[PDB]
Amino acid sequence: HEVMEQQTVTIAKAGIHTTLNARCSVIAAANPVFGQYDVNRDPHQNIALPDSLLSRFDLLFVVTDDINEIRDRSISEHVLRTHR
């Protein structure tokens, strides 16, 4: 939380006491928070990691590999063509 939005890191440790800057960009990949019920499951209870984090991330993209039948065949063909 402190890293992402605030854009800085703060160490009061022991110690050296300083506010030092980490202004990194961030990507994250997570599972379906238990139960493959990632596709059908509710807009909430699916994410598994409330709450403010869900906001901090500018974009939340969903990846259910669910047909979308006519989409499966195409993907398979693509993979086949690739296998070369």
Added chain:
Amino acid sequence: LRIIWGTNVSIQECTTNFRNFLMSFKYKFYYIKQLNEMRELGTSNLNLDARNLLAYKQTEDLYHQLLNYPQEVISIMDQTIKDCMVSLIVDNNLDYDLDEIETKFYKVRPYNVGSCKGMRELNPNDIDKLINLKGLVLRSTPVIPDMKVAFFKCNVCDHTMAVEIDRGVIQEPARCERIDCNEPNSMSLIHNRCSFADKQVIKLQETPDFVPDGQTPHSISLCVYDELVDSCRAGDRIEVTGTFRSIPIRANSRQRVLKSLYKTYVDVVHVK
């Protein structure tokens, strides 16, 4: 005037300046009352007050002579209070039966000279000075015996003559005692027969309430002496006064060489 080395606090001057200090309220802004209380009990250890000499005149300078040079000033102060006991007795004529009560050892216990700031603030420039300190005591060390009067022996004849330590060193005459006899052979130092005096050691954290936060407090080992030894236990957060000391330590190991960085400890003449 009898100048004494570099301390330059003159004998046969300050003694009288202290001798006429007697009988004062005064001022304030006790004194002889509490001494008259002292003479019966035989408890010795005159606690004084500090501040007395300030702002009081005379001896406005004596406060500065003690503060800047406590080492001699305490000894002279003890001599003078002893002779002022001697002069207290002759006033009432025959007292306490008779002269033996004066022979008993007395000392001054000065305290609260200015308000010093911490151990931490202290300059290395002031190494003989009276220094307030405060902090809890983490441990009270077992009693170490300290040399006062040394004893010596030889294979010849054997003879019992012995010499006092004085300064922090011991030099025995090569040869020899009584007489004579001689020969050149090394002196035999009896370990147990010689006299000893109590020296404790007390560890003190520097004011855990006052800290750089979060850096852990610094140790100050104050060694005390005499009656003060074993007069305390642990964790006492109150305050202590005494003379600062830097003494060399022996390093690696053996070699008889000095680490050249002197360790620092407090003589702590008084505790309150």
